[PDB]
Amino acid sequence: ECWSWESYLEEQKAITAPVSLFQDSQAVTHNKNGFKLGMKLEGIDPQHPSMYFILTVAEVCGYRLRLHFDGYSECHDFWVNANSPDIHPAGWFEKTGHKLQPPKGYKEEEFSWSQYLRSTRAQAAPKHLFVSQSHSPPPLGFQVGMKLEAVDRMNPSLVCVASVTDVVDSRFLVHFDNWDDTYDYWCDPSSPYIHPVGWCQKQGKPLTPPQDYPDPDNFCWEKYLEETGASAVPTWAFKVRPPHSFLVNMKLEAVDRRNPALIRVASVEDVEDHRIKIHFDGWSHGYDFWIDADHPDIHPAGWCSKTGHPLQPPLGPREPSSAVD
Ligand SMILES: CN(C)CCCC[C@H](N)C(=O)O
């Protein structure tokens, strides 16, 4: 009850990033978190986006939850918001035609929700909590098998030959041809990271062809499209979003990248058209990091208070790891 945004702003002569700068999903604070400790469900592996696993609610905190990969090590646990599009209710993969990576010890054929729930004596999280159940409209113009050019987010200076390999509700999965699946990332039509076939060519940018493509220097889209019999995502399907309007020094709240259980008071350290650099007030600049303006883990001031999540105040002066802020 002691720390408060109101007096911090007066003390610092600062301003917060207006709620209007965030996506509705990042700002909404009046939804109830119906998830309960022990409930089971399905979800994508954040580090291997094309794979689906059985997950359990290991912890609830405000509008967030910590999920655990059944049968596996706790080191894989991760946090998501209750309105996350990356989780689905029990039975979702079977209904949508997706494959499942069963719990440790199980074979994909030995898994059955009904029996599993009995063996574990648990309940499945009710369906009415999921925003994504594949009941909504698919992304206009993006179908499994189409080709496009996309930025490798792990190596962002590369624009590469890619394919759509999955579609779930209003989002699709970008995959880099002949490269490892862990480079995949879910995306939507307004993403600034995707471009139609030929973009690089009109921009003078070098295009990164499929891994080990014969005579990589002579890569030709027309040729590749004939070889694969695949079509390119149509140009009209791409509807890139406008650059965000966050300004340097605006304050907000952001999940700690080192200990995701925590959320800290933060400031906009720097900006790009679609990214912002986060600085945790009072902490060393060595911890500042870049992040997409639409990332689900940044929120407007007051989010923690309204959702019931603890908020870490600025680090005290002269403390270890601090910065004369
Ligand atoms: C195109 N992209 C999906 C992969 C780029 C990999 C770069 C480098 N060989 C590495 O392995 O880090």
Å from CA of 11 to ligand 1 middle: 47
* Boundary-marking domain end, from 243, 272, 298: 243
Count of domains for the chain: 3
Ligand 1 atom having least distance to the Cα of 176:
3
Å from CA of 312 to ligand 1 middle: 37
Ligand 1 atom having least distance to the Cα of 179:
3
Å from CA of 159 to ligand 1 middle: 11
Considering the domain architecture, whether residues 85 and 160 belong to the same structural domain is answered as no
Cα four-point dihedral sign 315, 15, 24, 170:
negative
Q: Which helix (H) or strand (E) holds 43?
A: strand 40-45
* Boundary-marking domain end, from 88, 105, 135: 135
Task: With beta carbons less than 8 A apart as the criterion, state whether 286 and 322 touch.
Answer: no
Considering the domain architecture, whether residues 79 and 108 belong to the same structural domain is answered as yes
Å from CA of 81 to ligand 1 middle: 30
* Boundary-marking domain end, from 135, 163, 189: 135
Pocket test for ligand 1, best of 151, 154, 157 (most atoms within 8 A of CB): 154
Considering the domain architecture, whether residues 92 and 159 belong to the same structural domain is answered as no
Q: How far apart are the first and last CA of the chain?
A: 24
Considering the domain architecture, whether residues 104 and 123 belong to the same structural domain is answered as yes
The domain spanning residue 16 has which CATH number?
A: 2.30.30.140
- Token duo for residue 303: 């989010």
- Burial grade of 266 (CB within 10 A; 0-12, 13-18, 19 or more): buried
> Which residue's CA is the closest to the ligand 1 atom numbered 10?
155
Task: With beta carbons less than 8 A apart as the criterion, state whether 83 and 325 touch.
Answer: no
Query: In a 3-state reduction of DSSP, which class is residue 8?
Result: helix
Pocket test for ligand 1, best of 154, 155, 163, 193 (most atoms within 8 A of CB): 155
State the DSSP code for 239. Answer: -
Other beta carbons within 10 angstroms of residue 47's beta carbon come to 9
Give the dihedral of Cα atoms 44, 49, 51, 52; nearest 10 deg.
10
* Residue given tokens 């910065």 in the structure block: 323
Distance, CA of 278 to CA of 289 (rounded, Å): 5
Ligand 1 atom having least distance to the Cα of 211:
1
Lining residues, ligand 1, CB within 6 Å: 152, 155, 158, 160, 176, 179, 183, 208
Which residues on adjacent β-strands are paired with residue 292? 275
Other beta carbons within 10 angstroms of residue 149's beta carbon come to 24
Using CA atoms, how far residue 168 sits from 47, 53, 102, 139, in Å, is 18, 15, 20, 9
Considering the domain architecture, whether residues 65 and 92 belong to the same structural domain is answered as yes
Considering the domain architecture, whether residues 187 and 275 belong to the same structural domain is answered as no
Determine the structural domain holding residue 91 and report its residue range.
Answer: 32-135
CA geometry: angle 20, 235, 214, nearest 5 deg: 120
